[PDB]
Amino acid sequence: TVAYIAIGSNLASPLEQVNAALKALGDIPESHILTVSSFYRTPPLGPQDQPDYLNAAVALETSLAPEELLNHTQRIELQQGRVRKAERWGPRTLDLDIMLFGNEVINTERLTVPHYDMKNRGFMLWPLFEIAPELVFPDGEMLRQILHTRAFDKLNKW
Numbered sequence: 001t002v003a004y005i006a007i008g009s010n011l012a013s014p015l016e017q018v019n020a021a022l023k024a025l026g027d028i029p030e031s032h033i034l035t036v037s038s039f040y041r042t043p044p045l046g047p048q049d050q051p052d053y054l055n056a057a058v059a060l061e062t063s064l065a066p067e068e069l070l071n072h073t074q075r076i077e078l079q080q081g082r083v084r085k086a087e088r089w090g091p092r093t094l095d096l097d098i099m100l101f102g103n104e105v106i107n108t109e110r111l112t113v114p115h116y117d118m119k120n121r122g123f124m125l126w127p128l129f130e131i132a133p134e135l136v137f138p139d140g141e142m143l144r145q146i147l148h149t150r151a152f153d154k155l156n157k158w
């Protein structure tokens with residue numbers, strides 16, 4: 001099954017965390033990485049000013065069940081998601097989201113697939129569009145259509 005996973009990091013210099021996460025994703029059992037999008041930078045989301053986010057999309061071939069995959073991505077968040085900052089470990093700065101899982105629709109206490117808000121997020125849709133321009137959602141919507149309809153700004157590469 002092809003699973004599409006979003007990676008986000010808001011560390012100030014996130015490349016080493018993101019590469020650690022990618023490696024960890026490639027090491028998930030019963031699975032392998034098919035393709036990785038470019039790394040994209042997106043601003044904040046508040047008045048003051050929070051760090052830029054690095055966003056990317058990964059295509060993962062897997063024979064795990066969806067909730068088994070989530071156990072692994074949450075495990076990677078716990079193992080790689082915090083960076084030591086001087087005398088203490090920082091808060092989680094890595095976010096792994098399952099955006100799509102095959103053509104499956106999932107609604108459990110743990111999993112909402114397709115990702116619950118991805119159609120509102122240029123930072124999720126544009127990296128996916130790079131690696132899957134012809135993608136169709138389980139409800140029949142086409143990825144291209146969502147981007148055409150909302151006209152989300154394109155994001156700069158990191």
Ligand SMILES: Nc1ncnc2c1ncn2[C@@H]1O[C@H](COP(=O)(O)OP(=O)(O)O)[C@@H](O)[C@H]1O
Nearest residue numbers: 070095096097098099109110111112113114115
């Ligand atoms: N498709 C999914 N992928 C990952 N976690 C999901 C998904 N759908 C729902 N969740 C739930 O979201 C919670 C974490 O959300 P949050 O902290 O906002 O992180 P993120 O934006 O990375 O999902 C988890 O407890 C997890 O069970």
Ligand SMILES: [Mg+2]
Nearest residue numbers: 077095096097
């Ligand atoms: Mg997450």
